[PDB]
Amino acid sequence: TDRVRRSEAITHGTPFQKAAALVDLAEDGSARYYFIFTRLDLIWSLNYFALLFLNFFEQPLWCEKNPKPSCKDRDYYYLGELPYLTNAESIIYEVITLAILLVHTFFPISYEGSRIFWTSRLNLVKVACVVILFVDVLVDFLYLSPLAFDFLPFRIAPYVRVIIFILSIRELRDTLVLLSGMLGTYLNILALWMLFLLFASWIAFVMFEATQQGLTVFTSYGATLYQMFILFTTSNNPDVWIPAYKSSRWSSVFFVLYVLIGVYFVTNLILAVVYDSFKEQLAKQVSGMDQMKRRMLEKAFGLKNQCIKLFEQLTNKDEFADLCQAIALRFQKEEVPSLFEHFPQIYHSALSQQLRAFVRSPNFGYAISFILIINFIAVVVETTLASAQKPWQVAEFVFGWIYVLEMALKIYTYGFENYWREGANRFDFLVTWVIVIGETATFWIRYLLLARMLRLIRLLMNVQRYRAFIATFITLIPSLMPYLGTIFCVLCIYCSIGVQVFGGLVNAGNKKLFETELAEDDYLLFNFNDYPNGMVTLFNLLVMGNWQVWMESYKDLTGTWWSITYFVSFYVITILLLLNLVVAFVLEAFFTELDLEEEEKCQGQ
């Protein structure tokens, strides 16, 4: 019960207790109102997620301008399968979440102090965002009366919801501070890339001037630069230069050289510059956190006898910082009592310790692992069947109980704390409960059986080699969350733009559609006609198989080359920057894991 002890010691503890708490919470990274607001922090978090999720269910703007047919003909408009809110439902949940937001944003005035509240920038920006949302909601509500407005051309709330979400979750804000560091360096390598495309497409344009390649593909410098930009992604390779190769096999040399330089040099040079600037900005950022950590330690200090008394609390300035950092890096945190040591003859009778050693024994692991292999054999045999399967319900139940027992013995040997502190044990816990629930409810099957397959990953987890890769993966998964969230918020902004600009054109009546590559390649459900559909289309533009099919199709559907600016800017922001950041993160992760085991060896030697 750490958090309650901490908050009690902070609010009511004696100065030595307060100091000990301040240092403990430094090691772990009006105070009553702050604690209350922290307890409400779950409510605030869920409200901010619901505030963003409203974008998925709000009815698309183009449905309001009286389409014929109505948007109920989701086949005619190739629309999604999520529902769209009525106006009534939208006004209900928009009102509830805006009211909770106003409460959330202004409640800190009760404890921060107004001079602080207005001196602080993050406050002023959140006040601006909530004001903008209040205005746009009140406008959209007043439009319930036709006297209020005749027409509404555009809507701003879909963007401000995302901004408020970004400003609410600090780790996203610190990721955007990092990114708005490295962006200035990134513009130089982006410029060198552009200048390379310009030159290469000028050479191509001169070289093919009167060939069939010129006359049917490189018809002008602009089309050349565009086709070459696509070919830098290689997505149109070899298709874009087949006419050249038909006219002279030697033409292949120019395109092989262009692809080779583009894919293996420049793409990697951009990656290297992004990786460098990431590493620089991350080291710069973390140094600021270490400095704040010192500021907190200096407060804990300011609040031989003093050293003895602090070490006495530990039994539960430069000297202080050194001692605290040393003991922190040297020693693990204090033990947590079980609920069961209170029973001497139960918990402490040597039969207990003997069973504890047994469950801890290696041969117990050998037994359980062999049983798990047998469970794998059991399920692989069972999936040969689809009433003959009925007896395998017995095997299902038996393995269910076996996992209940294993989990129980695990908590019997590592409590709740050292059990749940291990991510493997957490996965065990979850899959145990879900399958035990399924089986005890049994005693749709084809779908729930995928959980019985999912449990088989334990066979990989046990492997002495792969455990290193799996540990890299398991630490990387939570560590990537804010960068994936940054990408997802950019996708939300881009989808909103797509829904407003391109939504509604992909319908069965638009005869131009059946001229597009979408209708030729059958991609028709990957339209922007609603937010879900745009969101999955944007996943396709991210992995960017066939991505130019959309850029061509919507160029042709809109009739202006400016439609391309959406996909070009999307490529520049997501692929060339943010995803290369994620790549750098994975490389730093694995090499840190290798460095960590190299340190473990060097210190053990």
Add this chain to the structure above:
Amino acid sequence: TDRVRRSEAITHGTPFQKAAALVDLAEDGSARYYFIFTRLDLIWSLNYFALLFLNFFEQPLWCEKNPKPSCKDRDYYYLGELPYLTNAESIIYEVITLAILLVHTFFPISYEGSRIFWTSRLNLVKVACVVILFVDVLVDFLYLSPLAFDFLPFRIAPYVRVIIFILSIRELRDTLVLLSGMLGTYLNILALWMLFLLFASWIAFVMFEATQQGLTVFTSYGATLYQMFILFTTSNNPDVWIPAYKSSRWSSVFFVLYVLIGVYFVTNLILAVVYDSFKEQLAKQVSGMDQMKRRMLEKAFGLKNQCIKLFEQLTNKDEFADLCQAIALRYRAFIATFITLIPSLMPYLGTIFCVLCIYCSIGVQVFGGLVNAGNKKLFETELAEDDYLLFNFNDYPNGMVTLFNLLVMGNWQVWMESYKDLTGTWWSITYFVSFYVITILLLLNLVVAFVLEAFFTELDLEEEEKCQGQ
């Protein structure tokens, strides 16, 4: 200046100048006959290169079986534009390059001394390769005459020419030696990748078992694993799961998760393992180089006037090697990186090109001849739908450009499907699978790591220069 003074000093100079030559050539990184051998290096190189390029102009063997129509109707077989040598020319250039190769491979027999030469296994393997070439050339000559043979099923010379070329250039031979060590680590992450595909494809097959995705795309576990393997490359995205998305939009959650894990995690992990194991082998190589340089300098030492006479020649036991080491002394950063990276990368791009040569030779023997205007099946294939028919294996250039197209991983499954359906045998996929495993997941990831290392070296170098000037 330098090279003449060095060889002159080594052959005729005073021993103090001989030491000076040894140290100067160490700074710059019967000996008369070794000097002749070294000066001929250009002729040796050009002979090896001609022997390698011979594969581009040797007539494809399936034409020698006399098809109808003949390979004179190049359009009917979508053939390239390079000449095919006559039997006369092929015999002439094979004999000439064999004679010059025999000369080169025997040339060290004098200056190395027979026991030493034949003791060194690199000579022995070269001799095995050259004897194989001699035997196969003699067989090819006999096969000109009906008395010796009626037919020969398989021709080995196209491979051994590449093997001899790899053995001949030290920068290549050391590149493949470096590469051969990390393979034992590369096979582990390859096992993890295989196990991942197998399990993910099993979940896919059972999840969709009765759906339209199952009833059209994932019809058997085999088809599932194949389609998922292509989807790991992302090259069949979104195509493979459009039926699932038509039946229920929630299907997309599984394929999005599969692609995300495949790309941004596992492939990057394969890059990380290859990168680290390369950096390990590079470190071992450069440590071996430093050790060898020291051993040479120690020999040069073995040969106060002591100092003065050397400081005199320098105008051109550790104590000596340490002396030698002492007496050895916006876009600009990117552009310097790019400039130096090219002559640094030449070994690896060259090795990749040699692997393509082996694969192209296999391609011309196994698949060559299938893509022709009379093949009724061909017009059912994706090759014909996408008008890719010039990208075939009917001659060596065509195969080489097809192999480049696979190396860029553009539409690469078109050929794998089309040639599977042409060859009528699922085993044809092994060509493209093994190619992807060897070139993309290993060698080109190595190239990536080499580029990144070059860039970070350039940033460190300019930071060092700045800090030392500060």
